[PDB]
Amino acid sequence: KCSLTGKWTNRMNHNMTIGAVNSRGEFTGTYIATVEIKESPLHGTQNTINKRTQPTFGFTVNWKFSESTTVFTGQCFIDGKEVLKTMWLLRSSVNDIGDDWKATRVGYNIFTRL
Amino acid sequence: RKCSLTGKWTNRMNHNMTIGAVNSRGEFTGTYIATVNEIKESPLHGTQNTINKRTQPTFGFTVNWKFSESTTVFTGQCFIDRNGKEVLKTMWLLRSSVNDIGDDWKATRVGYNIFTRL
Amino acid sequence: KCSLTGKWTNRMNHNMTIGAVNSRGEFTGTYIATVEIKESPLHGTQNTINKRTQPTFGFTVNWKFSESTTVFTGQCFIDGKEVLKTMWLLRSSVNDIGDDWKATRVGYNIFTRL
Amino acid sequence: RKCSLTGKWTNRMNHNMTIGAVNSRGEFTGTYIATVNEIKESPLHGTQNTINKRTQPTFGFTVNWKFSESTTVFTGQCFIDRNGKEVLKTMWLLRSSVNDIGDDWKATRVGYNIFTRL
Ligand SMILES: CC(=O)[C@H]1CC[C@H]2[C@@H]3CCC4=CC(=O)CC[C@]4(C)[C@H]3CC[C@]12C
Ligand SMILES: CC(=O)[C@H]1CC[C@H]2[C@@H]3CCC4=CC(=O)CC[C@]4(C)[C@H]3CC[C@]12C
Ligand SMILES: CC(=O)[C@H]1CC[C@H]2[C@@H]3CCC4=CC(=O)CC[C@]4(C)[C@H]3CC[C@]12C
Ligand SMILES: CC(=O)[C@H]1CC[C@H]2[C@@H]3CCC4=CC(=O)CC[C@]4(C)[C@H]3CC[C@]12C
Ligand SMILES: [Cl-]
Ligand SMILES: [Cl-]
Numbered sequence: 001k002c003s004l005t006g007k008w009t010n011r012m013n014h015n016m017t018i019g020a021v022n023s024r025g026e027f028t029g030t031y032i033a034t035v036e037i038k039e040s041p042l043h044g045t046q047n048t049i050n051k052r053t054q055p056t057f058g059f060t061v062n063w064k065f066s067e068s069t070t071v072f073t074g075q076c077f078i079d080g081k082e083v084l085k086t087m088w089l090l091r092s093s094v095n096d097i098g099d100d101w102k103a104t105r106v107g108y109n110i111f112t113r114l
Numbered sequence: 115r116k117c118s119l120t121g122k123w124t125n126r127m128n129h130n131m132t133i134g135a136v137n138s139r140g141e142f143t144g145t146y147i148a149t150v151n152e153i154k155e156s157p158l159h160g161t162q163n164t165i166n167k168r169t170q171p172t173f174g175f176t177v178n179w180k181f182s183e184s185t186t187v188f189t190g191q192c193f194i195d196r197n198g199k200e201v202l203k204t205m206w207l208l209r210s211s212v213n214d215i216g217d218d219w220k221a222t223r224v225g226y227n228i229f230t231r232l
Numbered sequence: 233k234c235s236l237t238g239k240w241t242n243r244m245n246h247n248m249t250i251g252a253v254n255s256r257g258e259f260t261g262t263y264i265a266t267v268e269i270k271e272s273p274l275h276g277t278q279n280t281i282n283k284r285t286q287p288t289f290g291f292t293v294n295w296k297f298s299e300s301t302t303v304f305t306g307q308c309f310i311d312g313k314e315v316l317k318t319m320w321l322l323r324s325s326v327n328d329i330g331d332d333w334k335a336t337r338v339g340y341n342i343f344t345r346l
Numbered sequence: 347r348k349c350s351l352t353g354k355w356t357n358r359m360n361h362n363m364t365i366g367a368v369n370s371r372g373e374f375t376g377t378y379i380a381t382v383n384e385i386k387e388s389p390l391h392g393t394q395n396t397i398n399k400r401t402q403p404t405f406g407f408t409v410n411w412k413f414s415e416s417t418t419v420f421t422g423q424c425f426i427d428r429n430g431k432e433v434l435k436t437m438w439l440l441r442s443s444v445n446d447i448g449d450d451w452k453a454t455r456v457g458y459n460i461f462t463r464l
Contacts, residue, residue: 012333025178026159043141043159045178047185047211056209058176058187062140062161069163071174071187073209075221085218087207087456089189089338091172093163097193100203101244104189106224106321106338106437108458127451205338207456219359224319224439224456226340257410258391275373275391277410279417279443288441290408290419294372294393301395303406303419305441307453317450319439321421323404325395329425332435336421338456 002054002076004046008084008111016111021046031061040064046076054078067093072109084111116169117192117200119162123229130232131158140164146177156180162192170194183211188227202229234286234308236278240316240343248343253278263293272296278308286310299325304341316343348401349424349432351394355461362464363390372396378409388412394424402426415443420459434461 004027008016018029025046032039044059058073074086090105119142123131133144140161147155160175174189190204208223236259240248250261257278264271276291290305306318322337351374355363365376372393379387392407406421422436440455 024157041139041161043161043176045157045159045176045185047178047183049180049183052183052211054211054213056183056185056211058178058185058209060160060174060176060187060189062163062174064165067163067165067168067172069161069172069174069189071160071176071189071207073176073185073187073207073222075209075211075218077215077218079215083215085215087209087222089174089187089205089207090334091174091189091191091205093168093170093172093191095170097195097201097203100191100193101339102322102337103191104205104338105334106336106456107333208452219457220440220455222456223452224338224454225451256389273371273393275393275408277389277391277408277417279410279415281412281415284415284443286443286445288415288417288443290410290417290441292392292406292408292419292421294395294406296397299395299397299400299404301393301404301406301421303392303408303421303439305408305417305419305439305454307441307443307450309447309450311447315447317447319441319454321406321419321437321439323406323421323423323437325400325402325404325423327402329427329433329435332423332425335423336437 002078002082004044004057004076004084007114009114010109010111012109014109015114016042018042018044024048025055025057027059029059035065038063038065044072057084082113084109086111115194117171117194119171119173119192119202122232123202124232125227125229131229133158136162140171140173142175144175150181154179154181160188185209200231202227204229234310234314236276236289236308236316239346241346242341242343244341246341247346248274250274250276256280257287257289259291261291267297270295270297276304289316314345316341318343347426349403349426351403351405351424351434354464355434356464357459357461363461365390368394372403372405374407376407382413386411386413392420417441432463434459436461 015032025048046057061070130147158177162173186208247264257280278289293302362379390409394405418440
């Protein structure tokens with residue numbers, strides 16, 4: 001079984017900590033990144049349909065130093081070692097609806113255990 | 115005059131999304147109802163941004179589909195349009211379940227959705 | 233048959249003109265947008281496997297006033313009226329490889345005939 | 347010391363992409379070879395940016411798959427890495443063929459690819 005609970009890092013030296021997943025798949029945690037270091041909360045869910053050993057999942061990071069919001073989704077894989085393959089959408093704040101077209105960046109991130 | 119996530123929302127596909135109270139930290143929960151004339155209903159959880167108490171906040175949420183192994187995340191902004199209507203402009207990523215990490219490349223879709231009140 | 237040749241516009245009052253598609257699917261054209269108006273070239277291909285009435289396609293716009301590049305892909309649909317449902321990636325120029333993570337915006341565009 | 351598109355490229359999946367001469371307007375053509383141990387080979391066409399004659403230009407291209415009704419577009423930048431190696435960091439969209447405009451939402455994938463010389 002691949003579980004999101006615990007501590008994770010990526011190629012950018014990030015520090016992601018996720019708490020216990022309840023039975024409905026819900027979780028909370030923390031996302032720590034450089035700018036000097038800031039902590040921001042994350043809330044998310046993990047699939048529990050068919051209790052897959054390698055579940056898909058999703059979460060939102062509500063950045064504390066910034067008007068933006070990021071969303072991540074992906075799958076917890078086994079390779080023996082655990083890895084989260086993710087993709088993300090970073091939403092910037094824009095002042096007027098007609099600037100919406102440029103408000104959204106996309107990318108990826110690979111996480112592995114501390 | 116502020117744009118809130120709380121309430122009933124629909125899009126051009128007749129989905130109905132219903133969002134509860136946004137708390138002091140911007141957290142909220144809700145439901146995503148969609149035709150799958152057969153209807154299924156899945157929980158969602160996420161946040162809206164609170165930094166500078168913006169009239170048009172950014173936000174994000176995860177829908178944990180009840181009938182599927184997939185997961186979808188939405189992000190976007192709650193705008194007041196020219197006509198005074200509140201609209202959510204969103205983009206999303208839909209993650210499918212694959213068996214081998216070598217299939218990861220084909221597992222992620224992207225699209226968009228515009229929601230208005232119902 | 234849905235063909236990319238001709239003149240197209242979208243909700244942003246853009247003006248896109250595409251030339252003749254050869255037999256391998258290749259095409260050239262022009263993308264015109266506000267900033268005052270600038271013309272930039274586009275080169276692309278259209279699928280010709282199975283000669284579908286509603287082909288998928290792709291093109292790159294090489295913006296003339298800017299270091300960026302945009303790519304579009306999508307499908308030419310019939311609804312009697314013709315419409316291109318697209319999605320796009322806008323690539324910004326960043327000065328150093330470790331800023332790559334923020335160089336890519338994503339979005340959409342619907343085109344219809346002039 | 348400039349990063350050029352011209353040449354042979356590979357990624358972490360053993361695709362081999364080969365790009366011809368970049369002309370004065372930045373246009374180029376090439377080939378994308380990929381396992382589909384069975385190999386298929388499809389044309390690609392696109393541009394690199396020339397505004398300010400940058401040492402690390404942005405670019406984009408379309409691969410017109412020979413064995414499929416799909417289309418894929420790549421965009422990214424040609425960087426000189428810390429070790430002096432040229433690397434293409436790319437993101438892509440893969441468009442599938444669907445029959446009805448109502449299925450359009452499920453037709454577009456997104457991923458990434460990192461290429462290095464071969
Ligand atoms: C690579 C990646 O996943 C992206 C998506 C959201 C991004 C963060 C968004 C907010 C941000 C603002 C900064 O000023 C420093 C870097 C950070 C903290 C970003 C680091 C890279 C992230 C984590
Ligand atoms: C258009 C859009 O926002 C997408 C993102 C995730 C998609 C859903 C993912 C799961 C799903 C499976 C189906 O068989 C039809 C309806 C649904 C419920 C999809 C409808 C369209 C959605 C809501
Ligand atoms: C909506 C959309 O497709 C986006 C993708 C690329 C975008 C263009 C990218 C370059 C650009 C720079 C400007 O200064 C004005 C607007 C334009 C001309 C953009 C208009 C919206 C476009 C066309
Ligand atoms: C990882 C990546 O960049 C993706 C984008 C488009 C994808 C290709 C699309 C068509 C295709 C069909 C197959 O059956 C296997 C190989 C290929 C050739 C895919 C391999 C991975 C590609 C190249
Ligand atoms: Cl922006
Ligand atoms: Cl940028």
